[model samples]
Target: RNLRDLLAPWVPDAPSRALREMTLDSRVAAAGDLFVAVVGHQADGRRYIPQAIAQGVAAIIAEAKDEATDGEIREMHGVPVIYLSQLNERLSALAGRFYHEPSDNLRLVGVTGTNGKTTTTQLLAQWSQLLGEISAVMGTVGNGLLGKVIPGSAVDVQHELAGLVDQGATFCAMEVSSHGLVQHRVAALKFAASVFTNGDMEHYEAAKWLLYSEHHCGQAIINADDEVGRRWLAKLPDAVAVSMEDHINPNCHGRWLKATEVNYHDSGATIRFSSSWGDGEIESHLMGAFNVSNLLLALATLLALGYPLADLLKTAARLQPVCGRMEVFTAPGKPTVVVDYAHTPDALEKALQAARLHCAGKLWCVFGCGGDRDKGKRPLMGAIAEEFADVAVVTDDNPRTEEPRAIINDILAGMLDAGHAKVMEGRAEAVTCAVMQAKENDVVLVAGKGHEDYQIVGNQRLDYSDRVTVARLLGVIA
Candidate 1:
């Protein structure tokens, strides 16, 4: 790679030098590699320029903020050092050039919101793949083709997509956080569509929401159930508004989709919907309203992108649930068990409500707060479990910031009555107690630490997984 060619647009008068790989870390900046030094929040990459130079990097690009003027060129140990202003914002563009502009070649979709980004992204990839596109997904689980995520930092993003594109991924649906947008982690990637699946309504419009969709987003799929979404639709007339509530407006919302009726059972949900494109119903193989909301979001996005409703309907039931999000497990004569990452009060209520949709007899929740995290939310989470679930089993007395007894009491303090609660120390024991006690018709929700594989004990990590435990006990292979 030629540094002159790569930095042409930004630094037209830059000197020429042959380069190999590009990296932000000095440790990995070997000979012929290009080292990018920026002012990171944690470690200023500018501080490592000397280390990178010692490693024999071909050329160095450092942020010009305090070190030098923008477009300033210097020489250190026979290596060319070019400084550019605001490297973070421009890094995405440079990486885009260095890598063959891979994201622009594919139909890339960015799925953003408070919750359900993972679920919505996975759905987009899965449904698009079902329709026969070679699709990929990037998020907390990592980056890769559908069903084969391998995980990133930012320049690695364009480079990663370059690999996916080389491997023949014609499309990709990625989960981008608010942090991602603010940090320029998603810049330079031409998003064919931007999808929002918001469950929280704290402030409505985040700056993250403002940046990405405005920049690219060939199409926009927004959540109409949110006022923030409506705020978005007020300006974006061509955006695809998706709602579970009756929020889609004909006059303003140019194109839209909404679920008129949802029949959720132990297996999944039977969703009936009407949309601007057409009306149809499909059996979704995922549980709850949030799942239903995201399912509709995916359906709306695919439909907006012009995928036939009939074809999307054809593979609707095959759309799998994201594991540990609202992952379900069942066996003959066993209570339906759902493991979720619901530790907060809002999530606990929502999760229990989700499990409630499929429950025929009683709703059971086995959950507790993390050891030494937050005190104010303990009673709040406790109160929610008590209010939402028929039976609330308190589990895991581990947080040491406060004593175990006081923590349990903090939870008990918010309860209307202790009659709805049972105290158990070990999470496994509590889960076992609830699973064993509940009738076969009941639904047991094991909340907190959904996908996490380890928990801290005495500053040490120990292996623990809620899905593995629940699935094993329920006689499912998991």
Candidate 2:
């Protein structure tokens, strides 16, 4: 598309020049490409316009400062330069135009919340694909069409969606973080549906709720089990309410789904749910009560999108667990080891509670807080472990530059009684101790850094993985 047509709605009197690709980074700006320069939190992109031009960029779009310099257009070494006062707010639209509005081409579904975004998005993708559609996923697990995924960036959101469209992806489930929403990462693309997993009364949750108001994507799928989610149903009467408990508001005038029964096992859980679409049973390979809720949300979303309920239930058992999120490993006459990405207090409590469902003897929790993060949560996680697990093994989780003993002391401070806690400095050793000490009836949880394969020390990244460590200790390959 030409620059004039692409920017006519926003940038008037725009020069007529053909554009190949669009980018924000000056380093990657190439011949025939358009460079978008804006005032960011860290640095201003205006200073890099010359560098982008030097790299043979066909056009440059910079953020306008004031009325005196607003809506300005000029020529920079044979390349066109256009300025917009609200460049950051309009970047998504411009990128969408350049990328041919990729979200519109595919059935894009966005999952947002403080947690469960990655797993829920992957579930949506897997379930959609099971219903006979080519699906893709975009989130922390990386981005691409299903199993063949690679990491991407906020800069490549639309471009990747366009690429997925080119690869014949009929549907895409994306994880939308609060930062991504507020930063206008997905500000322009039209979403077919948006799923709100669960967010409490936290500031991060408030920001996540703003996605619908700030950018009206499409149909809303909310988790009615959450307090914030219950309040949201009033505003979005047409939204699909998904819940594990029988807690969906009776006054809700829209569609809803709730689990009537759930049975947790060593491998996974079996859920029997009754929904507006229909009542069906799902034997999922995913563990945890939160996962049951996540599954219902995915099912409700697809049913809201007109997928048959029978078809979804038929392929429910095949829906695999997301790597690092309640991923389980078992061995005969050995403690059941579960590797989960439960770092926060809330997540830790839930992970332990899920393990408790399967534990016939005892539940052992092995976790540690990251350095340079919110230290406030360290004690909170400790308290949760102390209260939930039969034994709490405190260990290092990417200690970074912080003293390991100091962080452990902070965690111990939260516990009312530190008698049941064991302090271990090395993470690999801590996991091994938990696995070896526990009996066959006991369950061991290796929390934090689920799919992450590296540990950050002071200035170096050491190769480490909880899954591999636990598997190796249990005399099995991960």
Candidate 3:
């Protein structure tokens, strides 16, 4: 690609030069590459500009915070160095040109929220794929075409989506983080539709709201069960409202989808729904009420895009649960066990509540908090476990750099009747104890780390997985 054509949108008088690739790192900057240098919070990219130039980069776009002004072009060793203000925000737009605007080629659906982002995005991808479109997911789990997630990185939106487009992907369900939105990572891409899951605090909700209001999120899908989501729904009358808790009003809300009846069992849920698009029953293999909501949100999102309700209904049964997200494991005559990434106070409560739906016997919650992280949520999670589950099992969940006992004590401090809960220092021991003790009809929820395969204790990262532990104990495959 020519540097002049790429920068013509932002810099009309840009010099002509053939560019090979785009990069942010100096070490990876190759000959004829466009090296983007920006001033970040932790480190400055300008310090590495000399290295990028030494590597024979054709052009460089740098942050002109104080050293220069916007669109200032200078020459270094016959290489063009163009300075631009707010280079971080403008990089997305710049990359869009280089990638030929990949999002425009994709039916991109953005899922942003606190909890259900991964699951919702996964559901959307799987559902879309089942409906015969090659779908992809970009999120915490990773970014790639469906069934080939290679793990997420600082990889730009246009770059990755362009790769998917090159691979013939017609649809994409992207997980939009509040950080990604604020940082202008997804700013360049055009979203076909955007979904807001039902969870978050104020500042968190503010960023999620910004994507719908400020950004060009073509159509909006709001999870009305959230108070803020409901408020946002009130503002965007054209947005589609999806709810499981009777939050949607058909009389006023024009486009809506609500679960009329949901029967949660040991395996999954039998959902009966009514929507502005149409009404149908869904046999969802995903676990819990929150999952039911997540599935419904995906359903509403696809329907709003004009896919037939009947086709979505035909494909709903094939939608699988995202790993470690209300992920269930059941074996012959053994207790139903659920493994979830519910480290937060609200998430733990929701996971327990979801596990409760499948339990004919005692409901058990086995969880712990990460060390050196948010110490505030420890007590809150402890209280939630005590209040929600019939039995609370305290266990180690990556007690990194902090004394295991100190973290345990912090959790125990939150419980009303601390003695009633079982305390096991080892996570494996805790899960085994709960699984061994629980009756066949009981349901156990292993919380904190969901699909994580390692435990960081002190300075050592030990290989550990709640899924493998639970699956082995229950005589099932992880």
Q: lDDT winner among the candidates?
A: 3
lDDT of 2: 0.87
Could you give the C-alpha RMSD of every candidate to the true structure, in order shown? 3.8, 4.3, 4.1
The residue pairs in collision within model 2 are none
Off by over 4 Å in 3: 10-12, 39-51, 62-74, 83-86, 152-155, 199-214, 343-346, 367-383, 394-419, 422-433, 453-465, 472-475
The CA lDDT of each predicted structure is: 0.86, 0.87, 0.88
Task: Output the lDDT of residue 72, model 1.
Answer: 94
lDDT of 3 by residue, 328-447 (tens): 899989888999988899878878888898788999999998998879999889999999999999989888988888888899899999999999989999999999999988999999
For residue 148, model 2's alpha carbon misses the true position, in angstroms, by: 3.2
**TM-scores, each model vs. reference:** 0.86, 0.83, 0.84
lDDT of 1: 0.86
Q: Over the full model, what C-alpha lDDT does candidate 3 score relative to the true structure?
A: 0.88
Ranking by TM-score: 1, 3, 2
Q: Model 1 Cα displacement at 461 (Å)?
A: 7.6
